[PDB]
Design an enzyme around this catalytic site. Structure first.
Site, PDB file in Angstrom:
ATOM      1  N   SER A 131       0.816  -1.211   0.000  1.00  0.00           N
ATOM      2  CA  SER A 131       0.000   0.000   0.000  1.00  0.00           C
ATOM      3  C   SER A 131       0.847   1.256   0.000  1.00  0.00           C
ATOM      4  O   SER A 131       1.490   1.567  -1.004  1.00  0.00           O
ATOM      5  CB  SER A 131      -0.961   0.001   1.199  1.00  0.00           C
ATOM      6  OG  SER A 131      -2.147   0.698   0.884  1.00  0.00           O
ATOM      7  N   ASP A 177     -10.231  -4.487  -3.343  1.00  0.00           N
ATOM      8  CA  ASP A 177      -9.586  -3.546  -2.434  1.00  0.00           C
ATOM      9  C   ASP A 177     -10.441  -2.295  -2.271  1.00  0.00           C
ATOM     10  O   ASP A 177     -10.722  -1.597  -3.249  1.00  0.00           O
ATOM     11  CB  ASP A 177      -8.217  -3.179  -3.001  1.00  0.00           C
ATOM     12  CG  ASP A 177      -7.307  -2.521  -1.989  1.00  0.00           C
ATOM     13  OD1 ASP A 177      -7.786  -1.758  -1.122  1.00  0.00           O
ATOM     14  OD2 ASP A 177      -6.090  -2.753  -2.088  1.00  0.00           O
ATOM     15  N   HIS A 208      -7.910  -5.624   0.645  1.00  0.00           N
ATOM     16  CA  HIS A 208      -6.678  -4.836   0.653  1.00  0.00           C
ATOM     17  C   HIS A 208      -5.482  -5.634   1.174  1.00  0.00           C
ATOM     18  O   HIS A 208      -4.337  -5.364   0.785  1.00  0.00           O
ATOM     19  CB  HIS A 208      -6.885  -3.578   1.508  1.00  0.00           C
ATOM     20  CG  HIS A 208      -5.742  -2.613   1.457  1.00  0.00           C
ATOM     21  ND1 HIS A 208      -5.197  -2.172   0.267  1.00  0.00           N
ATOM     22  CD2 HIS A 208      -5.052  -1.989   2.444  1.00  0.00           C
ATOM     23  CE1 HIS A 208      -4.217  -1.323   0.524  1.00  0.00           C
ATOM     24  NE2 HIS A 208      -4.112  -1.189   1.837  1.00  0.00           N
TER      25      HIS A 208
END
Length: 261
Positions: A131, A177, A208
Site C-alpha cells: 500500500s 480492495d 486490501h
C-alpha cells in the site's frame, strides 16, 4: 550467468512454501534511518545474492509483510522486512527508509560480526511493499533506476504517474480492495509505466490485505514474486516463462504484462 542460483524451477518448486535454501534470520541491533528490521538470509545459496527491502503499510508493521522474508530468502535473496520510524509515515518518507535499509544491508555485508557477512551482491537490489509501502517502493524505483526489480502489493500513492520508472515492476493488486481501489490506484499506476518490463497481477475477490502474511494464495503470489525477482534481480532466463506468463489461475481476476518475453 554468474548470478544464477539454485535448481531449475518448476511450478511445484515455485508454489511450495519454501525454496531449496535453508533460511536464518536476525534482528537489526541498531537500525540506521528506519524504525526496525529483520534480515532473512540463505545459509547455503552457493554465491552472493541480491538484497530486497520490504515496507509495511500505514499503521502496519513487519507482521503484515513477514511471510515474504522466508519465502524469498529460501530461493536465494537477502531480505530485510522494515518497521518505519512512525506507523504514520507517508510514502516519500517510507521510500527513504527503504533505501536506508538497503544501505544498511550493504554495510552489514562488510561487517565480520554480521550473519550476512560476504553474503550480498550489493550491486543487485530490489524493493517491495504494501500500500503506502508499495507507493514507497515505486518512489524508490523512480529515484534509483539501478534497482533491478520492484514488486509492490496493493500500492497507493498520492500520485499514480510513475512514467519515469525503468525498473521491471510487478504490480500485485487485490480486486475488491476498498482502501486502495484498483481502478484509482493499482491500475493507473500500472498504466503510467511506459518504459519498463511490467506486469499487473490482480487477485480475484482480494481485500486490501490479499497479499499479506497468512493469505490463502501464497502458492500463486509467492510463485510470481519469486519468479519476478529471479528473472530481473539475477537476469535468470530460466524464470522468463514463470515471470512473464499469464499464470492461468482461477484466483486471478485480471492479468496484463508488457515488455515481458
Amino acid at each position: 550467468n554468474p548470478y544464477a542460483r539454485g535448481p531449475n524451477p518448476t511450478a511445484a518448486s515455485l508454489e511450495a512454501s519454501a525454496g531449496p535454501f535453508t533460511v536464518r534470520s536476525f534482528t537489526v541491533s541498531r537500525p540506521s534511518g528506519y524504525g526496525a528490521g529483520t534480515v532473512y538470509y540463505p545459509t547455503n545459496a552457493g554465491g552472493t545474492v541480491g538484497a530486497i527491502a520490504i515496507l509495511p503499510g500505514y499503521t502496519a508493521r513487519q507482521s503484515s509483510i513477514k511471510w515474504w522474508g522466508p519465502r524469498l530468502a529460501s530461493h536465494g535473496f537477502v531480505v530485510i522486512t522494515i518497521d518505519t520510524n512512525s506507523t504514520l509515515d507517508q510514502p516519500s518518507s517510507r521510500s527513504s527508509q527503504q533505501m536506508a535499509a538497503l544501505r544498511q544491508v550493504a554495510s552489514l555485508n562488510g561487517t565480520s560480526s554480521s550473519p550476512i557477512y560476504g553474503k550480498v551482491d550489493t550491486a543487485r537490489m530490489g524493493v517491495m511493499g504494501w500500500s503506502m509501502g508499495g507507493g514507497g517502493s515505486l518512489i524508490s524505483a523512480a529515484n534509483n533506476p539501478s534497482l533491478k526489480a520492484a514488486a509492490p502489493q496493493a500500492p497507493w500513492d498520492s500520485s499514480t504517474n510513475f512514467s519515469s520508472v525503468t525498473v521491471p515492476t510487478l504490480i500485485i493488486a487485490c480486486q475488491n480492495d476498498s482502501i486502495a481501489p484498483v481502478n484509482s490506484s493499482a491500475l493507473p499506476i500500472y498504466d503510467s509505466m511506459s518504459r519498463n518490463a511490467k506486469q499487473y497481477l490482480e487477485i480475484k475477490g482480494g481485500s486490501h490485505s490479499c497479499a499479506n502474511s497468512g493469505n490463502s494464495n501464497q502458492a500463486l503470489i509467492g510463485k510470481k514474486g519469486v519468479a519476478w525477482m529471479k528473472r530481473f534481480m539475477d537476469n535468470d532466463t530460466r524464470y522468463s516463462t514463470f515471470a512473464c506468463e499469464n499464470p492461468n489461475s482461477t484466483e486471478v481476476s485480471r492479468f496484463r504484462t508488457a515488455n515481458c518475453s
